Design a protein around this ligand. Sequence first.
Ligand SMILES: *[C@@H]1O[C@H](CO)[C@@H](O)[C@H](O)[C@H]1NC(C)=O
Length: 168
Amino acid sequence: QCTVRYNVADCSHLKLTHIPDDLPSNITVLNLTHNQLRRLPPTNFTRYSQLAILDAGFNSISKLEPELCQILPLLKVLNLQHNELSQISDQTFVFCTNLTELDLMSNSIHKIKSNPFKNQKNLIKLDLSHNGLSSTKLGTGVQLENLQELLLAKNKILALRSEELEFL
RNA sequence: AAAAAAAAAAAAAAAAAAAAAAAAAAAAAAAAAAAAAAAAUUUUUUUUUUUUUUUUUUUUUUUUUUUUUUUUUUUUUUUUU
Ligand SMILES: *[C@@H]1O[C@H](CO)[C@@H](O)[C@H](O)[C@H]1NC(C)=O
């Protein structure tokens, strides 16, 4: 099964077909990376409500439900790199007010609309790379008060304009 | 028909590390070899120059014996004109 080993559920390559929810729920770090994940269940995380950070990356996940943000209010690191994520919106990030780290290395998010990060105030580093971005614009209002890293690499931005860079 | 994410295999090529070895070249250390130049203990041989002993040839010198001719100093008994 998973490693556990003092609150670091580093679940390595074990061909886990479904997301497990075992007895050791009193942990803070859980690693779903390198595990067969069809999608993240919005209701299966009730058992593990003490996950300070989670590592669910490289997995094949279609879309993210808003419930995941409210089932785990104490969420700091959201590493979701190398996923499908055909389309995303602000609704899935409504309850993620304590988010501080995000990783998205391959998601093919060509178009971004509205303000997906209106509720993210403590989000420090941003990793939006290799997602086929055509413009660097993220919104029209002023948001992301405390941002230190904005990674936009391997994308297809053609030019930079003052209108699309005024959101910070 | 096309494009991508977890999850398991296999094939060509390039650059690497470790281990078991095997050859070629180069360094010493030992056991020997063939020699052209070397030194040192013993017994012998040839040749040159010199020492000692013995036996003999030639020449020279001293002494003694004997023999033959000359200068001869004398004589006794006689002869002698
Ligand atoms: C949630 O748990 C149920 C019951 O164990 C299971 O049937 C379902 O597949 C799980 N879903 C996810 C997303 O883990």
